[PDB]
Design a protein around this ligand. Structure first.
Ligand SMILES: [Cl-]
Ligand SMILES: [Cl-]
Ligand SMILES: [Cl-]
Ligand SMILES: [Cl-]
Ligand SMILES: [Cl-]
Ligand SMILES: [Cl-]
Ligand SMILES: [Cl-]
Ligand SMILES: [Cl-]
Ligand SMILES: [Cl-]
Ligand SMILES: [Cl-]
Ligand SMILES: [Cl-]
Lengths: 223, 223, 225, 224, 226, 227
């Protein structure tokens, strides 16, 4: 009973790739931050797909048997949509958060699923005897508040985001506010030419329109 | 067959493998190591969380100068805790035994997953899956400093049968003593009263006895 | 039904896929990356610890203002290393001199599930009933280099089992194109635990050249029949 | 002109010593926490005496010419009072009796803190006069690994009243303050030996048997 | 004169003049903080340690126990107070002699008596304590975090908590590689303006664009006795 | 004499002599920084707080909200400036009274005037400012990191940034268990020698082996104002 988790990066429920039956839908969870420590859910795994959304989907308990819910300064992070940031750059609150949160689908697969990386602008071909589920971009890691964050296993479908976003995730707080922040970095595999592997990498600052020219491509395959 | 099911009893007695499943080994429930004030975690659902031989210091480190130190610095280990009452002083040598949770690795016919409700009610296994145990949604933990780690929500490790405010113990490797310290936090998923979306989470504090109803429930299911 | 196993040679040569498995692709052994002073690790047992193309900077970072920087800050990459010694001057290694330092890996398709068992002794652990051996090694658990940042291995993953024990099993590479070994680069191994000394207070031990493997736990990677 | 800084550890402001003119009173600021990175003020220096209290007394800016105030998840830490530990986080006005008050005075000479590392109170060095007697306050941690410490020469390492929880956490956005279970206070110990201790023996102390293990101090001023 | 020292930062390429009542010791470049082995250590801007006579993108080296000292040989940082110089129209890192117009200049001055900074916590100027004369006015600069959220800060009694000119990005990030640049995570924290009546009220979230930045920034004054 | 203090560190087992013009208050042991609950907190070497009258591997305790205080019961560190005493040939933890010969001694001296440090950023000794007399010379000491890359540093204006004798490993790591040892991750950071010519260019990456160490370490001098 193999599983494949797919993220739409939009407000709509993503359809299961050709060959896989649907189990349940939910909201795309990237990572949580509790007591200033980041803990993540791998996007390729079903743990990145919570059935219910909350800016604070967790509480903490101590040795004195005292639990606190949304009482301190903790974070939750979800994959974001193409929904534009309000022009005032103000914290998004209440039910205005729904259009910002990505949706996901946990699908039952007849066989094992994997992701391949090219380290090139060209799409990496699937291994011999493996059929393609989807293509995308190489999503390695991310850091937001206190430069804390998590990443993805490069063999997992979670390292393969179907749609490239310069801001792929939104920061939500237990105070009930969500917003993009300047320190929210996203890390993607670089395009490396085979002839330049063991040469000094040439520094490149990429403007809008050139962003994906140095971003590696990926394909999620199933046997 | 071929899958590895891991059971954590949360008691000083080893848990039994379900019918048809042959036991590989029983050990001690390892949560995470802490070397150089950096926490590396073992997923409670994976067979790595079940270490056969217990020690306050079960690891050593080496530097590039061809020198290895064992129990020579201030490193730590963390193990899943039993129901045993909280000691007044740090427990020593033989008196540590009833505090350390036991585990079992069972050989399984199919991959076992954990599903979460984020609700008061027990989540049901999807079509074609049978339930193994009912527990509580165990997300993450922090103890000494900022260090800790967490559990994958798809992994059966995120589903502990018994809810406990402090489900793990700190074992100081060099001194050979273990103890519950006040900076231990256990993070659990919450109950959301709505269908799928929670707007602004209301702040609350929960004393002993009123806790379990706000903790999310889970089931571990096998194909 | 599509199981994967990743082997690391710990040398400049490609490792051969263990008995029963078929080769998919070769590459370079990636341990962990460090971007914005934070470390993210690829488990050595998974295919993600094996990239087809090496770079001292194999990643870039993007911000909310739709700007992406490649090798334009101070970021790191960490790769499994070879028996190749450190130079006389102990200066940073750059250019095609890095090639003999980087380990090679192989991603292999397995017919059955792969796992690692640990003896916690100097003895080699036997494979469980119904399982067959692939390779033996030493119990590799975790590592820290710069800023005490790093990552670790799942103990039931083939990544926790390095075939050859190395005091310095990894090399530190920077976006400047320089790779070097550093004093703070630690490698954590499972120690040997005796049945008697389980709940006893551990005896402090300091091992030198030729005594390093005396307290290192042994492992075997097994695949079910 | 040296500046003396007193912390009353009560909701009332402390009096400046006779002859020394009070510049201002305020609230005893321990440290800010921006971006989960703690920035501390030394309790012996006037910077710890912030004239106006707020759960969020700071803002932040980025190179995009944009500034945020109480918009993210930042913190502030303030020295605490004897006030009963609240069962639930205090809010708006009920915060008042929890925050310690301070005073910055104009001293004719430099004040220093001397530590005994012993049960007995240290006597001031020759040519120095006593100002107050306290306990040796070293460092603190609260949220994550974050916190900070006091300087042992600085009068701020000498708190008149010992408390295992000498500080409170004020959540800037929510506007609430509360004591949490991970708040540690660090104090210098009593060493029974003359000047050197070899192998320390681990000890756990319940309420009542604590203070006899805390190092004692005196804040002294040079005579002129 | 008993040896009291005050450090002024011009936040431009020109040397700052020693404030009235003080005499000049030496000039240099405004060092905010260094970062080695991914840990930040800073120098208080009011102290002379924030004023180094010589600039380098790597002004330090480290040594290990095996008697080996490495200079500009790992991935380390140095941070300097920055000029009004606009960021290049490519956001690409600044190398070589092109860095000079970006680095602030400083002056270490000897004061006859103690130097201190007062804070108003309003848009108004805080008055000097009775018997203290003014040296300069500015804005309340508390702390900063750049790479890996690591950074340092200023003591509020120290003159270094009082930058004469408010900057959104008061500091530039320099690397051992010999590259300096501004980054999106380089935050600068300033004391907020609060009203006496608002003190214990729940703070109102505010977002400030270009033209509204100094609206909620507290003011400060650096004073000197006699 | 308004109450000015100068702290001198011998970096030996001997008590350092107060520089010319200053009177001795007390002697002690050179404390660099402590590390409690994984956070490092440092005492500036130029201040009297870096000079503690009594030594311990664990000179502090901690207390929780439950009014329970733990002493030397967890995994915490203390760090002390060290002597030129050689590390044992076995390289094993040093315990008990065997620690004494490794711990540097300090002296807190009452000064008539304010004390500062000047840094040249060259191999040459920077002269004292106009109207300032020289107390001692040394090497520019900026920061340090040991366990978990946590540590602290010095203020460059303070005399504590001016260590008299250059050491590749200037400090030792002590644990609350009662053991002290040098470790491979213990780095010391010093100001580098910069030239006015290559002030605004690419810094040349250099690795220095034994004997070449002090060739790039900046020089400093601690000065005190004339009365
Ligand atoms: Cl919260
Ligand atoms: Cl240890
Ligand atoms: Cl505790
Ligand atoms: Cl880089
Ligand atoms: Cl090194
Ligand atoms: Cl805030
Ligand atoms: Cl709590
Ligand atoms: Cl460098
Ligand atoms: Cl940026
Ligand atoms: Cl301890
Ligand atoms: Cl070591």
């Amino acid at each position: 009973g193999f599983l494949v988790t797919r993220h739409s990066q939009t407000i709509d429920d993503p359809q299961c790739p050709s060959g896989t039956k649907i189990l349940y839908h939910g909201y795309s969870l990237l990572y949580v931050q509790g007591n200033e420590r980041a803990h993540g859910q791998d996007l390729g795994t079903a743990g990145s797909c919570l059935r219910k959304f909350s800016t604070m989907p967790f509480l903490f308990c101590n040795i004195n048997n005292v639990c606190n819910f949304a009482s301190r300064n903790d974070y939750s992070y979800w994959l974001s949509t193409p929904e534009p940031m309000p022009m005032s750059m103000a914290p998004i609150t209440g039910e205005n958060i729904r259009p910002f949160i990505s949706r996901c689908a946990v699908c039952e697969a007849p066989a094992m699923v994997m992701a391949v990386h090219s380290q090139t602008i060209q799409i990496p071909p699937c291994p011999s005897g493996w059929s393609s589920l989807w293509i995308g971009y190489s999503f390695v890691m991310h850091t937001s508040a206190g430069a804390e964050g998590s990443g993805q296993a490069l063999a997992s479908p979670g390292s393969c985001l179907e749609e490239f976003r310069s801001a792929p995730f939104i920061e939500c707080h237990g105070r009930g506010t969500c917003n993009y922040y300047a320190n929210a970095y996203s890390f993607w595999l670089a395009t490396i030419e085979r002839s330049e592997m063991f040469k000094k990498p040439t520094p490149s600052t990429l403007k809008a329109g050139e962003l994906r020219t140095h971003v590696s491509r990926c394909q999620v395959c199933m046997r | 067959i071929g899958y590895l099911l891991v059971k954590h009893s949360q008691t000083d007695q080893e848990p039994m493998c379900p019918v048809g499943m042959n036991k590989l080994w029983s050990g001690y429930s390892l949560l995470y190591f802490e070397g150089q004030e950096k926490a590396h975690n073992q997923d409670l659902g994976l067979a790595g969380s079940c270490l056969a031989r217990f020690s306050t210091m079960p690891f050593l480190y080496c530097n590039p100068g061809d020198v290895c130190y064992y129990a020579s610095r201030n490193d730590k280990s963390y193990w899943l805790s039993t129901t045993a009452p909280l000691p007044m002083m740090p427990v020593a040598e033989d008196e540590i035994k009833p505090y350390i949770s036991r585990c079992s690795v069972c050989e399984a016919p199919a991959i076992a997953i954990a599903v979460h409700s984020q609700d008061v009610s027990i989540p049901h296994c999807p079509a074609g899956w049978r339930s193994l145990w009912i527990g509580y949604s165990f997300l993450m933990h922090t103890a000494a400093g900022d260090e800790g780690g967490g559990q994958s929500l798809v992994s059966p490790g995120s589903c502990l049968e018994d809810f406990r405010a402090t489900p793990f113990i700190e074992c100081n490797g060099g001194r050979g003593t273990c103890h519950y310290y006040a900076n231990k936090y256990s993070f659990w998923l919450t109950t959301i009263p709505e269908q799928s979306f929670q707007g602004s989470p209301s702040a609350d504090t929960l004393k002993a006895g009123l806790i379990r109803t706000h903790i999310s429930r889970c089931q571990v299911c096998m194909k």
